Symmetry: C2
Subunit: 412 residues, 2 copies
Amino acid sequence: SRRRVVITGMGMLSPLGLDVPSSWEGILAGRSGIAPIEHMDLSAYSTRFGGSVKGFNVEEYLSAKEARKLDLFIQYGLAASFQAVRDSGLEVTDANRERIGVSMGSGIGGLTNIENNCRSLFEQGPRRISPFFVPGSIINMVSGFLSIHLGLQGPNYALTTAQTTGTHSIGMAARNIAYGEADVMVAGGSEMAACGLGLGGFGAARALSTRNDEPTRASRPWDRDRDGFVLSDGSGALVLEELEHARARGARIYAELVGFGMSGDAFHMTAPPEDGAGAARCMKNALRDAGLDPRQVDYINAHGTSTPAGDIAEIAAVKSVFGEHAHALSMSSTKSMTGHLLGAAGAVEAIFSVLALRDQVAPPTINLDNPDEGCDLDLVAHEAKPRKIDVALSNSFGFGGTNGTLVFRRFA
Amino acid sequence: SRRRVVITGMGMLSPLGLDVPSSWEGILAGRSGIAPIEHMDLSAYSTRFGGSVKGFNVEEYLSAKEARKLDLFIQYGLAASFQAVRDSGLEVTDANRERIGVSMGSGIGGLTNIENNCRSLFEQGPRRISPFFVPGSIINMVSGFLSIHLGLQGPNYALTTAQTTGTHSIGMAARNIAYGEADVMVAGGSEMAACGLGLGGFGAARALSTRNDEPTRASRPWDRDRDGFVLSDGSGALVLEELEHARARGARIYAELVGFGMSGDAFHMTAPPEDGAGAARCMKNALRDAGLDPRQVDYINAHGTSTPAGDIAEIAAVKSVFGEHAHALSMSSTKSMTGHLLGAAGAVEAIFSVLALRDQVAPPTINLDNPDEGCDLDLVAHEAKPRKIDVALSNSFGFGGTNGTLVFRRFA
Ligand SMILES: CC(=O)NCc1cn[nH]c1
């Protein structure tokens, strides 16, 4: 058998806000977090906008001295993690510290740090490389620093599965608790790839929307005018907890994590298969994992990245998995407002999926002015839709054809 | 309910050889793979030597056209993966492809590639960034490219837990099989951090041996004259397989994976606690996981990095876990010969642990001329030691206080 896993805490930095409730308020209002990127010369770049975290004060979390040691992506993961744990009311003790672990991930890691240390290296030589360069830049330091700050002695690791990281981190954390390896896990991802390398790298692959004139309209999933994804920064963390452990201490439970799917497309390095065969297997594996019929799904938070091939693959996949239920469920892309947080996309979108359950409302896909050929599902165009939601899926599909699906269910 | 997991295939690039047999011959002969680095000008650096992979021909594996797009760490991970799958004799079919996955990890990933594109960005501009920068550098693309080349549609992911990456990758892949999420996994790690940022970054932290005038004597675990670890490159991959699946197809089985342990130190970003309390918790979790008496442990493949604090912490941990049996078992560090392959360390060392079981021999700790205060166990100084090994244990410890232990035993 297998233990049940609930969500007792959530934390977040997004382009919509510095915590969950401010972000969610943005989501439900259909507000864009997308704007031209400030403090950074993007003159020579084909993209000049994205979703930045606005007004982030790391000294709410760390001393200036400790924060100087850590890439922005680590600072963002720590913010969300500290918010989630505090949100949970959990008390770490000598009696439970060994049963509390962390799996916070990143798709791309410490590009901003790598870039600033490259500056010093090329200009002045290696003796100007920071001593904290390595531990301050590597992806497992959100899990590392979090475990040290809070005395967490349970499983300590980090996933890096590109744009699937947040979904894989939360799902595998859920398994840890299910199979009795931990009672609590902090899980999710964080990302800050708005450097020359992030913007330039994705720009060189022409993966990015170049709609510089209207940044808030750039991210337009399933719209016939979409021209690639919008690069966004931030973090999501969830406190996952064994149900009996949660009930014993009188935890507030947001929702239950009932299902987790993984699959490989084995198709292409960056492009999904047109029929979304991969996303289809992943979702079926997730629903089998939950013991649920496709007919029981009410709400899907799409990957919905606003790439030509990605959006269409996901329509094909849902139609394949859900047959005559495909029009009944609501499916929206919150990336229409947040843009694409890469490795943190699945973390924030899991939180939005959980809040859709709490509040019985499907978030909008904004900018969906002219749905493309075959995009005739209920994609919650323009405005939040109040509706019945017992079961919510969150999908992530990343480079290497790596797929992730999470199934959350109302708890009561 | 929990299924058993065996090793049916192994693959490797190391500073001692371009495969497992060649590498293993060097280990038992006590040969060093450590030499001044030839691929760049290190005269401005305080460390000028490492374990390079010598004479790697990527066109034994991949088209020059595909190889040109990929960081060496990905080329190294693919090379070891292809070797391991060939060594397993497994045939991928429509019938089984959905039950075969991959978890190949890296500590740092595509740091050379990121440096090169960073140079292009700063010297020329964003328009000279490779269109393959992202899919050619990010850590999950060993798992991705492997899945694409062989058509593996099982769980597809990557860990990044610094110097623990290979041990965790293998351990968690076994759990995937144990719990029925897959019947087969290719798992391990790859690293190529021997660029300016890598040697400069570890150099800035004063973590590396500076013995530039005698590189083969640099890596000297538990020796009183040790002065840091030696940075080495390469890859380890294992085919892990549910026992009955292996039996059904008549697979040759090298050994059984009976035990996996994880723990966080929750101590320090980069330093281990002097008493090895985190390593001790991890090894105890792994032995309890294997259903063993600690006295069954015959051979330990130590982390054994040749750092002052790391080496002694591990003595403390082994004494605390094994009591008087700490004086009966044999413990060696193959890092004495290979150097520290970082995220690949746990992968090659898992392979050396399985070959200690096959060949009934403890690999030497070379350069152990003057064991330090309290380093009074059988550390197999200087020369391989033929002996009874029924149970072998492989330890890794990383930045963020992240610990991993694998337990393997003979299968008959
Ligand atoms: C330049 C050189 O080889 N010096 C000797 C040494 C011993 N430990 N670290 C350095």
